[PDB]
Amino acid sequence: PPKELVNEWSLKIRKEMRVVDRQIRDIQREEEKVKRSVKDAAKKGQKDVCIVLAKEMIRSRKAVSKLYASKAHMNSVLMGMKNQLAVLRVAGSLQKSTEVMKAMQSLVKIPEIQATMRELSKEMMKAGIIEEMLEDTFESMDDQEEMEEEAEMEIDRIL
Amino acid sequence: RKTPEELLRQNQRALNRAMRELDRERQKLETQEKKIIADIKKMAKQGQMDAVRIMAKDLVRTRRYVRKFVLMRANIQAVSLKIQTLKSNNSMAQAMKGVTKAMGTMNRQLKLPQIQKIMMEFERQAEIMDMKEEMMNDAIDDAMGDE
């Protein structure tokens, strides 16, 4: 059973993502600690110390970026695991679908269907010859061109 | 043993449950995506140049995975539609067999020759009746004179 272990380790993935997130937020705490030192060094009349304070700040920013990249990598591998759980479930459902198709095709197959094909074709063929012959012989009895000509004449006096 | 009808009806809502899971593991990712959007929006205020690109990459990853989630969900739908039309095919087959049996046992009582005999007898009787009428009118109308 892969389902519970996938969930089991997903419970640890963001378990460590929260460790990473706290690691991050500590860095912005230190960045806020040092930004006001940059501010004060800017105001105290000599500006060239603020460059070294900025050296500190950009190092902290790089640390933040690296930690965020690590968290993103963790998220990506987690999503891959979830995707593959979905894929395995799809494969199992497809296997069951193949099984039910086997069960249904266990009933009828081509040869009985072909027997029905030819029996229906022959029966309808004889049927059509009987019906057409009957219609022709009943119409071999009374007029066609005349007996149609007054037909619309009968309709004309109705409307 | 289990009847084949039970297997198909079980597979129906089994595939439905698979769609259900796919729905859920989809739904979690839009929440994750909205969290990423909120984070990238709040973080872009202070700039910091680079980490925005990592978050955008993660956003694109989430979109690519919801793509596949929707794709497998659609695949399950096609499988369900096939297994559903399968029993319609079976029903067509059995009804066709029944109508063929009925029509065969029906036209087994009347064939080509005996109806042809009946029909020739009809034509002969119609000949006799029409000859009765035509000459009956003929001799007595021609017996009439001056008109």
Curated annotation (Swiss-Prot), chain A:
Result of altering residue 49 to D: Abolishes interaction with CHMP2A and assembly into helical tubes in vitro
Bilayer topology: Lipid-anchor
Keywords per UniProt: Apoptosis, Cell cycle, Cell division, Coiled coil, Cytoplasm, Endosome, Isopeptide bond, Lipoprotein, Membrane, Myristate, Phosphoprotein, Protein transport, Transport, Ubl conjugation
Entry keyword annotation includes Ubl conjugation: yes
Domain of life: Eukaryota
Gene Ontology biological process terms in this record: apoptotic process; autophagosome maturation; autophagy; endosome transport via multivesicular body sorting pathway; late endosome to lysosome transport; late endosome to vacuole transport; macroautophagy; membrane fission
Gene Ontology terms, MF aspect: identical protein binding; molecular function inhibitor activity; phosphatidylcholine binding; phosphatidylinositol-4,5-bisphosphate binding; ubiquitin-specific protease binding
Tissue expression notes: Widely expressed. Expressed in heart, brain, placenta, lung, liver, skeletal muscle, kidney and pancreas.
Cell division is among the record's keywords: yes
Domains (record comment): The acidic C-terminus and the basic N-termminus are thought to render the protein in a closed, soluble and inactive conformation through an autoinhibitory intramolecular interaction. The open and active conformation, which enables membrane binding and oligomerization, is achieved by interaction with other cellular binding partners, probably including other ESCRT components.
Family, similarity comment: Belongs to the SNF7 family.
Protein name as it appears in the record: Charged multivesicular body protein 3
Shown segment, full-protein numbering: 11 to 169 of 222
UniProtKB/Swiss-Prot annotation, chain B:
Molecular-function GO term, any one: phosphatidylcholine binding
Family: Belongs to the SNF7 family.
Post-translational modification, as annotated: ISGylated in a CHMP5-dependent manner. Isgylation weakens and inhibits its interactions with VPS4A and VTA1 respectively.
Protein name stated in the entry: Charged multivesicular body protein 2a
Membrane topology designation: Peripheral membrane protein
Location relative to the cell: Late endosome membrane; Nucleus envelope
Keyword Transferase: no
Gene behind the chain: CHMP2A
Domain writeup: The acidic C-terminus and the basic N-termminus are thought to render the protein in a closed, soluble and inactive conformation through an autoinhibitory intramolecular interaction. The open and active conformation, which enables membrane binding and oligomerization, is achieved by interaction with other cellular binding partners, probably including other ESCRT components.
Subunit relationships: Probable core component of the endosomal sorting required for transport complex III (ESCRT-III). ESCRT-III components are thought to multimerize to form a flat lattice on the perimeter membrane of the endosome. Several assembly forms of ESCRT-III may exist that interact and act sequentially. In vitro, heteromerizes with CHMP3 (but not CHMP4) to form helical tubular structures that expose membrane-interacting sites on the outside whereas VPS4B can associate on the inside of the tubule. Interacts with CHMP1B, CHMP2B, CHMP3, CHMP4A, CHMP4B, CHMP4C and CHMP5.
Coiled-coil positions: 5-46
Biological process according to GO: autophagosome maturation; autophagy; endosome transport via multivesicular body sorting pathway; ESCRT III complex disassembly; establishment of protein localization; exit from mitosis; late endosome to lysosome transport; late endosome to vacuole transport
Keyword Protein transport assigned: yes
The species this protein was found in: Homo sapiens
Keywords assigned by UniProt, alphabetized: Acetylation, Coiled coil, Endosome, Host-virus interaction, Membrane, Nucleus, Phosphoprotein, Protein transport, Transport, Ubl conjugation
GO cellular component entries: amphisome membrane; autophagosome membrane; chromatin; cytosol; ESCRT III complex; extracellular exosome; kinetochore; kinetochore microtubule
Miscellaneous: Its overexpression strongly inhibits HIV-1 release.
